[PDB]
Design a protein around this ligand. Structure first.
Ligand SMILES: *[C@@H]1O[C@H](CO)[C@@H](O)[C@H](O)[C@H]1NC(C)=O
Ligand SMILES: *[C@@H]1O[C@H](CO)[C@@H](O)[C@H](O)[C@H]1NC(C)=O
Ligand SMILES: *[C@@H]1O[C@H](CO)[C@@H](O)[C@H](O)[C@H]1NC(C)=O
Ligand SMILES: *[C@@H]1O[C@H](CO)[C@@H](O)[C@H](O)[C@H]1NC(C)=O
Ligand SMILES: *[C@@H]1O[C@H](CO)[C@@H](O)[C@H](O)[C@H]1NC(C)=O
Length: 577
């Protein structure tokens, strides 16, 4: 009986983003006892609730959410005694929440999420003993959780996240026999999680993250079966993960990231067969990862980075065919990379950098049809980078730098359809560049620096998307290709520390956006083409330690660092000619 359906020659036009108190005011004028539901949500309304609203004495349902209602909460609403659900969420109500909610003794649902309330949580609420859902999150509430809130049985949902609450969590809250959902993180709570919370047998969702809590993780919480979501991240928990937590048979999501947990991932975790998401990022965890974690049938997300895990990755990880994102960077992992990681073609993000992984890149990875971002720099991977990556049609980011790869660079990389980043630096190839590397349709950053490259730099035909090129610190001999002007997007070029002889390619002056150029430590000869001096993008031009000849250009080279030169010949920039 809302939206102006039942009248209740009078308008029932609910739109035209009008402010309010009298756009309705009228809508309560209709003395009506035939109005049981009032849904004025999302009408861009603004103003106050008028006192006259008390005459809708038959109201059961009132939704005023998603407007711009302001001022203190309207006490008049409390005179709506048959109110059963009340939604005032997503508004701009401020000041302390006034006492008097008690008269709404039939209230089952109170949602006031996202408002401007301040002061203390109303202790008043604890006398609504039909109440089931309570949402007071997203405001500026202060102080402690009133221990009397634990007197709310039938209550199955409580949300108080995103306030400025603090103190210690009231152990009495554990008496909430029917609580299924508890979301009270993003506050300033301190102290430990109460042992008593282990009595919340019906609890399916447990937050309390981004707080200031501490202590060991309370073992007793292993009693909380039925629990599907356990978020305790961004706190200050210490000690080990309790082995009792392997009894959480319903657990789907686990997040202990950004704490100070130590010890090992308990081997019982291998029995949590419903785990979807396991995140233990940025802790002081150690020891090995239980083999059984690679056989969890539903595991899709695996975050273990910034710990100090040792040992092998579980042989059969990924064999469930459901692994999507894995990040175990910043550890001390060893052994080979399991071949089963991308079984099912669901793996799209594979981040393994900063470990001690050895052996050959498993060739199965080249048939990972969903792979999108691959970062495995800083390891001990050996052998030849396998051929097949260029056939992955969504591979966009590859970092295999600082490894121990040898012989040839796979020629498919050149024909990878969407590859945007490719490093490969620091790697001991002792082979030529693939001769059609610069035809890569998409490739913005290519950095095979200090990778023991040899031979001539192939002709820059194509060079469509390149804007950063790093090939410094190799043994590239021959001449810098004279067709470098095909690289119209180029910004930074480093060919320093090679064996490049011959002239500086004039066609560099043709580049619209070239900014940083380093050709230092080579065997270059000839002039710096004076047309360089009319560039209005070149910021760095290090060409020092060469055999160049003639005057340095003027124009926009007159304000360059003289250090950029160290060949026998110059102009006023240092020693006149
Ligand atoms: C209030 O309205 C919004 C959108 O109109 C809806 O999603 C929400 O469930 C409503 N609240 C209640 C308690 O029914
Ligand atoms: C993770 O690496 C960061 C720097 O990348 C470092 O500050 C931190 O100490 C590392 N943590 C562990 C547990 O190795
Ligand atoms: C991590 O463990 C390995 C040896 O198992 C070693 O790097 C060191 O003991 C630990 N590193 C840090 C930073 O604690
Ligand atoms: C390529 O990798 C090296 C070492 O792994 C790193 O120092 C460098 O910054 C990387 N280059 C780019 C462009 O990311
Ligand atoms: C340098 O280039 C010449 C081309 O004549 C080639 O014969 C020689 O092997 C190259 N140097 C190497 C590969 O070390």
């Amino acid at each position: 009986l809302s939206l102006k359906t039942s009248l209740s020659k009078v308008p029932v036009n609910g739109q035209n983003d009008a402010v309010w108190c009298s756009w309705s005011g009228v809508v309560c004028d209709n003395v009506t006892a035939q109005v049981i539901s009032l849904d004025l949500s999302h009408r861009n309304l603004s103003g106050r609730i008028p006192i006259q609203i008390r005459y809708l004495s038959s109201l059961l349902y009132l939704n005023l959410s998603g407007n711009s209602l302001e001022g203190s909460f309207p006490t008049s609403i409390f005179d709506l005694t048959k109110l059963t659900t009340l939604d005032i969420s997503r508004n701009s109500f401020d000041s302390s929440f006034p006492p008097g909610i008690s008269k709404l003794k039939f209230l089952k649902v109170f949602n006031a999420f996202s408002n401007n309330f301040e002061g203390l949580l109303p202790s008043d609420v604890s006398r609504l003993r039909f109440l089931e859902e309570l949402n007071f999150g997203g405001s500026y509430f202060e102080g402690e959780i009133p221990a009397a809130y634990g007197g709310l049985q039938r209550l199955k949902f409580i949300h108080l996240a995103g306030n400025v609450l603090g103190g210690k969590l009231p152990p009495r809250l554990g008496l909430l026999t029917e609580l299924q959902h508890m979301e009270i993180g993003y506050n300033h709570f301190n102290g430990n999680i109460p042992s008593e919370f282990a009595l919340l047998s019906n609890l399916k969702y447990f937050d309390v993250s981004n707080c200031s809590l501490s202590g060991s993780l309370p073992q007793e919480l292993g009693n909380l079966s039925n629990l599907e979501t356990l978020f305790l991240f961004q706190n200050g928990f210490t000690g080990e993960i309790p082995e009792s937590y392997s009894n959480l048979k319903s657990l789907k999501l686990l997040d202990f990231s950004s704490n100070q947990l130590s010890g090992s991932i308990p081997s019982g975790f291998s029995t949590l067969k419903n785990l979807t998401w396991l995140s233990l990022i940025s802790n002081n965890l150690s020891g090995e990862v239980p083999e059984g974690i690679g056989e969890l049938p539903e595991l899709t997300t695996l975050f273990l980075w910034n710990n100090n895990f040792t040992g092998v990755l579980p042989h059969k990880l990924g064999s469930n065919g459901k692994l999507e994102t894995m990040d175990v960077s910043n550890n001390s992992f060893t052994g080979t990379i399991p071949s089963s990681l991308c079984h099912g073609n669901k793996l799209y993000k594979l981040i393994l950098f900063s470990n001690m992984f050895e052996g050959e890149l498993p060739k199965s990875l080249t048939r990972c049809e969903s792979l999108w971002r691959f970062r495995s720099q800083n390891n001990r991977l050996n052998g030849t980078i396998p051929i097949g990556f260029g056939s992955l049609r969504n591979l966009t980011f590859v970092d295999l730098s600082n490894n121990r790869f040898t012989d040839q660079i796979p020629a498919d990389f050149a024909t990878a359809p969407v590859l945007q980043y490719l490093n490969l630096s620091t790697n001991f190839f002792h082979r030529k560049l693939p001769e059609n590397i610069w035809k890569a349709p998409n490739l913005q950053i290519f950095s095979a620096s200090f990778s023991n490259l040899i031979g001539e730099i192939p002709n820059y035909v194509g060079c469509k998307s390149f804007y950063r090129i790093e090939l410094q610190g190799n043994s590239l001999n021959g001449t810098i290709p004279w067709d470098i002007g095909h690289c119209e997007k180029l910004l930074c070029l480093n060919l320093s520390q090679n064996h490049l002889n011959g002239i500086i390619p004039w066609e560099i002056s043709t580049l619209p956006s070239i900014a940083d150029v380093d050709l230092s430590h080579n065997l270059l000869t000839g002039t710096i083409p004076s047309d360089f001096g009319s560039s209005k993008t070149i910021t760095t031009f290090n060409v020092s330690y060469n055999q160049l000849i003639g005057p340095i250009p003027s124009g926009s080279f007159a304000h360059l660092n003289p250090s950029f030169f160290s060949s026998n010949e110059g102009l006023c920039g240092d020693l006149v000619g």
